[PDB]
Write a protein that binds this ligand. Sequence first.
Ligand SMILES: [Zn+2]
Ligand SMILES: [Zn+2]
Lengths: 67, 148, 50, 115, 260
Amino acid sequence: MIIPVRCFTCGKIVGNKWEAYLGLLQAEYTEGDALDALGLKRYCCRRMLLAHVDLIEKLLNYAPLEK
Amino acid sequence: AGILFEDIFDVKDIDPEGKKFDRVSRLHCESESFKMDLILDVNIQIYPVDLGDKFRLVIASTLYEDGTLDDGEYNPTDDRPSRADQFEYVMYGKVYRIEGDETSTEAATRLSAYVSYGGLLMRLQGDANNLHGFEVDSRVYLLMKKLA
Amino acid sequence: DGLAGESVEFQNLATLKPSNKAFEKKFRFDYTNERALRRTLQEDLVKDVL
Amino acid sequence: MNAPPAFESFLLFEGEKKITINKDTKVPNACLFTINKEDHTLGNIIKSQLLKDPQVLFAGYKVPHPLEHKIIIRVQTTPDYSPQEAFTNAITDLISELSLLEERFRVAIKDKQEG
Amino acid sequence: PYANQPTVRITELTDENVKFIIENTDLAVANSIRRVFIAEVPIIAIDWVQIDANSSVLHDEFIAHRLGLIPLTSDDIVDKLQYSRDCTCEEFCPECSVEFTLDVRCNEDQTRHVTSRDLISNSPRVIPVTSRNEQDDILIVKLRKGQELRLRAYAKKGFGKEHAKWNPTAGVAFEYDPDNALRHTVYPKPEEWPKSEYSELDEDESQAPYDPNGKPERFYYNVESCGSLRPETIVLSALSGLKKKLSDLQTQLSHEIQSD
Ligand SMILES: [Zn+2]
Ligand SMILES: [Zn+2]
C-alpha cells in the first residue's frame, strides 16, 4: 500500500527513497541506474523499490467520510 | 615393549580402483623385510603420501615406552613418555577380523589381520609367524613415519 | 503357533536347500578324524569322543 | 494468543537465578552451569575461551530448546583445578580481551579521523 | 591459558559505515561481537503511541508500526536514559523517554505527504535521523483534503533483541578466510566461484593451498548504520555491552560460588 520504512531483510531505510525513485524514472534512468543512484547496493533493498506497488494513491481517490 | 609388528613398506599403488573419497586414500604397499602386503586408508589431507614413498610402520598395543595398558580414553594432558613422539602419523583402532589359509587338519601358513581405525581400514597379510600378536577385539595403535 | 506377531523375525532354514553330500558334510559330526578334533576340541574332549 | 512477551528472552522473572552450578556425578571434576536468559552470544565465547585453557578437559554448551531462554555449559578439569575456577578465569580473560579491543578501536578511530 | 591480544585496523570510515579488520582473536569472539551489533546495542525508538485523530486511509496500528521503525538520533542520550523498568516514575519522565507529537491536516487539493519532519520532539538531541541537517524524509502517510492525523508518542530505550526497531544496523558484512585455505567451505568446482574482495590470490588460482595448521585469525567487518548511531559508536557500544554482560555474569557466579 505504502512504501515500507525498512527493508525487511536488513533494516535499511527505504521509506524516504520512493518519491526520488519515481523522480529518477522520470528523467529516463533505467530502474537499475535509479536504484544505484539511490545507493541500494544489496538486492534485498533493490527488491523493495523495484517490486513496490503504491496502492495508497488509489485509496486517495475515495473521498473521506468527514469534510 | 608392546610392539606387535614393525616393518618398512614401499607404496606400490594408491587408489587403484579410483578415488572413492576426497580426504582419504587407500595405499597398497609391500614390506621389504617380512614380505607383508598392506592395504591402508590414510587421511592424505593431513598426511599426504606419494607413489613410491617408503615409510616405517609400527603396530603397537600401547603408546607408552614402558609396558602399560591403555584405557582408551582421551587424556591430552598425559605426560608419560610416548612412542608417538618418534612418529608422524598415528591412528587408533581395533582388530575386527583374522582370516587365514588354515584347513580342517592343518594350521594356517598365511594370516590376514583386519583393523578399523574409526572406519579407516587396514589389511596386513603375510606369513602367520609375523601376525601372532594380533587378536580380534584388541585395540592397537598404528604409527607411521616416512623414510628419506 | 501361539506367538505374537511383533516378536518374530526372518530366519533361514539351513537344512532345506543343501544336497545330500553337502548336508552330510556340514551336519554329520565326524568322530573319526583325530586331527580335525584336535584342531576343534581340547584334548580331554578328543579322548572322550574318540 | 500464546505469544510470549519479547522481553522474556532477556529479563529474569522474580526469583529466577541467573546461574546455577550442579556437579556432574558421572565423572570427577565436572560441573553443569545452567544460565538463564542467555543465548549463543555468551555460550559460544565462554566455551571457546575455556577450550584455550590447558587444565580444561571438556567444554561445551547447548541451548536445550530455542523457545526456552537458557544455556547449559558443561566443564571438566584436571583434578588439580576446578571447573568453577576455569569458568571464572575464562570470564576474566574475555573481559581483558574486550577491554584491549575497545582501547585499540578508540585509537584506530582517532587515527582515522585525523590521519 | 589466557586472553587474546587482538588488533584493529580501520580501512574505511564514513557517516554511513565503518570497515575494519580484527586480527589475533577467536572466531567465537568475532561472532559474538557481530551478534551484539544486531541484538544488544541500545538505541531510542518510538514504542508508545496514542492517536487523537486519524482520518487517513491507513489504520492506527499501521501508522504506529511505521512510527516505531523511524530511526531516532541516539548517540549521547541513550547512554544517559534509564530503561522504563529501572526508572522510578509511574509511567514516563525525561529520564526514561522522549515525547513526540504530530499534528497534520490536509487543507489543499494537493496531496499532503506526512513525514518524519512532521514529528516534533521535546528533546533536541533525539530527533528523526532524516531531520538532522540530500536524503529525503521518511514518508509516514499521505493525506487527502480533509483527512487529518494527530498523535502523541513516547520513545524508549531498547535493543534489537526485544524488537527489530531497536536494531541500529542496516547490514553487517562479516567474512573470514577469504581464500579458502582452512577449507571450512568446500567447493565442488572452485573455478566457478568469484573472488572475495579480500582475496590475495592471483587470477589463475581459484583457492589457496590447504593449511593444516591454521585457524580463523583475521576477520573483516563492514558495519553499516541505520543512522540512529554513528558506526563507530555501534562498535564501541557493542564492546561495552558485551563486557558488561560478562561482568554481570561474573558477579552472579561469584555469589553462587560463595553460596555453595
Ligand atoms: Zn536490504
Ligand atoms: Zn521514567
